[PDB]
Design a protein around this ligand. Sequence first.
Ligand SMILES: Nc1nc2c(ncn2[C@@H]2O[C@H](COP(=O)(O)OP(=O)(O)OP(=O)(O)O)[C@@H](O)[C@H]2O)c(=O)[nH]1
Ligand SMILES: Nc1nc2c(ncn2[C@@H]2O[C@H](COP(=O)(O)OP(=O)(O)O)[C@@H](O)[C@H]2O)c(=O)[nH]1
Ligand SMILES: O=C1NC(=O)[C@@H](c2cn3c4c(cccc24)CCC3)[C@@H]1c1c[nH]c2ccccc12
Ligand SMILES: O=C1NC(=O)[C@@H](c2cn3c4c(cccc24)CCC3)[C@@H]1c1c[nH]c2ccccc12
Ligand SMILES: [Ca+2]
Ligand SMILES: [Mg+2]
Ligand SMILES: [Mg+2]
Lengths: 427, 440
Amino acid sequence: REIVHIQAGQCGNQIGAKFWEVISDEHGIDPTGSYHGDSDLQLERINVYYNEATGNKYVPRAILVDLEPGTMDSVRSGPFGQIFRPDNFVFGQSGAGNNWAKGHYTEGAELVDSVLDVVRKESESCDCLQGFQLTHSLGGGTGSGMGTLLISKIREEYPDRIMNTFSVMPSPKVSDTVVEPYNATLSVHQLVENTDETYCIDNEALYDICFRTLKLTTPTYGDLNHLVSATMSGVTTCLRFPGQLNADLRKLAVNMVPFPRLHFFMPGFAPLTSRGSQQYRALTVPELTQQMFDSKNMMAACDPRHGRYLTVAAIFRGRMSMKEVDEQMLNVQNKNSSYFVEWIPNNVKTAVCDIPPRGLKMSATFIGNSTAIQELFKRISEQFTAMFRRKAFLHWYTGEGMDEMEFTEAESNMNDLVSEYQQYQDA
Amino acid sequence: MRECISIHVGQAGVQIGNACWELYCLEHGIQPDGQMPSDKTIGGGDDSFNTFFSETGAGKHVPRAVFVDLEPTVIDEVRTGTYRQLFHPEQLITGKEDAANNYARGHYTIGKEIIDLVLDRIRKLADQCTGLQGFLVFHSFGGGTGSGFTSLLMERLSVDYGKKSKLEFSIYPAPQVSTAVVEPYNSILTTHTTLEHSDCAFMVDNEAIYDICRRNLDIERPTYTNLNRLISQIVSSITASLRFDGALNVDLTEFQTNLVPYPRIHFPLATYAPVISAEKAYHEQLSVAEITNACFEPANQMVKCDPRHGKYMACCLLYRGDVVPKDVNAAIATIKTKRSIQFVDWCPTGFKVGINYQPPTVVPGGDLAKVQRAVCMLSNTTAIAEAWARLDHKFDLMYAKRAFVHWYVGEGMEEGEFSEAREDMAALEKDYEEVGVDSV
Ligand SMILES: Nc1nc2c(ncn2[C@@H]2O[C@H](COP(=O)(O)OP(=O)(O)OP(=O)(O)O)[C@@H](O)[C@H]2O)c(=O)[nH]1
Ligand SMILES: Nc1nc2c(ncn2[C@@H]2O[C@H](COP(=O)(O)OP(=O)(O)O)[C@@H](O)[C@H]2O)c(=O)[nH]1
Ligand SMILES: O=C1NC(=O)[C@@H](c2cn3c4c(cccc24)CCC3)[C@@H]1c1c[nH]c2ccccc12
Ligand SMILES: O=C1NC(=O)[C@@H](c2cn3c4c(cccc24)CCC3)[C@@H]1c1c[nH]c2ccccc12
Ligand SMILES: [Ca+2]
Ligand SMILES: [Mg+2]
Ligand SMILES: [Mg+2]
């Protein structure tokens, strides 16, 4: 079951390139595209993310998209820049100027067909395509605007395939422009309708982790992406390696999503580490379990105690007692059964993978469908309203043909989403 | 690509152009003959400095610029000056008769005779661009050409280039270096006519620059040369992101997104630091915190007004030289808890920061000390409207008596254009008042 990867915009390509860099190392693939590992566990399900060429060359099933060549040129000159199929580099020249309208309606519409041709070429090679995964930000123009345009058009041509996204949420703590709440709100409207699974990667959370926990005085985007690539490697582990269940995108969606619109997940990770700084002491299983469930380890700035977990998926990596993992995970549920909804029996599942990530003897990744995620969308909604009530900065959008009504609709649907998450918090 | 074409109109625009392009050449290591030894791609390239310079097969780097004036004597100095080799003769356009401090003559009588030629020469530059981003227009408010012809040109550019971005560097009149008593008339007329056709305009109060030269560089009576060398440094700081690359480099268009909340509210207040003499800068290092704090000293502003009695709608800091984000954040945190910085309630309070590692440059035999780090703050403040208020008052005093109006009427203008222009300014002053009112 092949997955087609897509990365759009500056953020999307930078975390996307980092994702491929990390898992390539985990699967023993070098920049040349040649395998140099020692375990057969690495190649068993490598077809999920990699195409195979003659001479046993492994090429990522990835499509790189942007409206300006700047960031993609940095990828192609990056560490694993040469591994990507050069024909999968699809770019414009005008840019999007952090404008959702430009990415979705004008500049991006001019380029979107070229992308879909590459998507089609990749898909026809698949023995049995299971779905797509997209990396992008919601605060910009390309990843947000054109990204959601792509999703809509991909759904039109592949309505029976799963759509997954790693969506980076904007934050004033790590802000490029003031219009990020506009772009984000417009994008959430799209993601609610046209994705089955969205990992909410909150820059507010990423910043707080780097500052408070990792003791990084002034965190960069590179520091933020160390947490993203660690998270992305974790949540895709059960897709990339042989496990007890051999998870795929559809089975994940069925088990995680009780109601179609409530498919926005809070990722978590433990241990939290900064770049370069190697840790010498492996965490005990009780420590991994306690940390991964802590708010400080959440990649979405939401307090999980302010809501209830609808579903939880967890993956422990490294050589450890799977019996001990079972006991500790069962202990969390039995100690804090109030933060798990009672009308979904056995809504917590844990898996284990022998292969640990680079630089850690063991780790634990967390995927939570919590009603507390509403705090994220409420935060965006407040920032949206503060500007929209005065129609501030709206001329950037009306200048591309958008109407005020489209903003009002996007606002209403996100507020609906919030109230929907609130509905099941008091069930 | 992302080329930018500069247009220098009238004496002020041209002479400021001379300072700016001379400064650009020194920053990029371009010689007066146009040769650039460090540039290995001969005859072309997609480097950052190519946004402002085209290249000939002979290795000459030519400014993407047009110099226009209705009188020949100012541009004649460029034609015979140090950098005469820099420009192709067709880039330097002159008439035989100026606008005589009259907007009407610049826009109609004299300007209409040369407007087609100017547009043709601008077109020749645009056709050399692989991805034209927009135009930068340098001009005075008070001159007949800087006022009249600029507004005509801006109108014609909107027709020929649609919604292609057009930025302004406008010289706001001051009595200390005044050239005409009707400069307030020309100022109001131009601002009104150009308002719909400009996306962003950086006003430079000559009195502000006059004061800074007197106060900080101890120049007892500043000349145009003194003023222009200071101005070019502010201009350089603003265009630096277009002419250089860097990790922490933020494009001017991104700042522009934050600086313009409504189309008519597009007049950022520029503040530059440090302006200091060689005598004072010797054995004296101005840190990041010191130059950043200087951005909130009204004495360092390009326009005379009091932001402390107004509200902010954006705050951008454009650093250049030896500067790292860590020291910026610390400096900002200190400033926020000690200064009168208040934002409107409908806008976020975060400062947008950009850094270009390329250190500041000074022109030989200049007055400005060479420093390791400088900063230009671009803020959108309601206080800039004070500049409109002062101009509109001087306009009202004369127009109530219709003083000097006959010089305009004689050139075909009508009193309706004066009143129409003044009403637009009244609405603009009201606009800045409204955006400052708290939300309901
Ligand atoms: N900062 C600065 N201001 C200047 C300079 N030259 C002229 N000005 C200002 O420009 C205003 C007059 O406009 P000018 O540019 O001189 O006149 P013009 O644009 O050639 O139009 P004409 O009236 O036809 O000559 C005055 O208020 C001057 O103070 C200059 O070199 N530097
Ligand atoms: N985590 C992370 N976020 C980023 C990065 N670059 C930009 N962003 C975020 O994405 C938003 C800007 O979108 P961007 O990707 O630059 O616009 P685009 O290139 O047009 O899609 C802002 O809210 C940024 O915080 C990055 O490298 N890492
Ligand atoms: O392997 C797996 N396949 C599934 O469908 C997942 C699952 C989620 N829930 C399940 C339930 C029952 C059975 C299986 C699963 C209860 C609620 C949520 C499960 C998984 C555990 N940790 C992961 C980490 C990353 C990706 C997948 C997984
Ligand atoms: O050079 C010049 N050209 C002008 O138009 C003159 C001028 C008069 N007013 C001006 C005003 C503003 C600016 C320039 C001038 C205010 C009112 C009267 C000015 C001048 C100054 N002293 C002179 C002596 C003899 C001949 C000309 C001049
Ligand atoms: Ca070159
Ligand atoms: Mg960006
Ligand atoms: Mg003149």
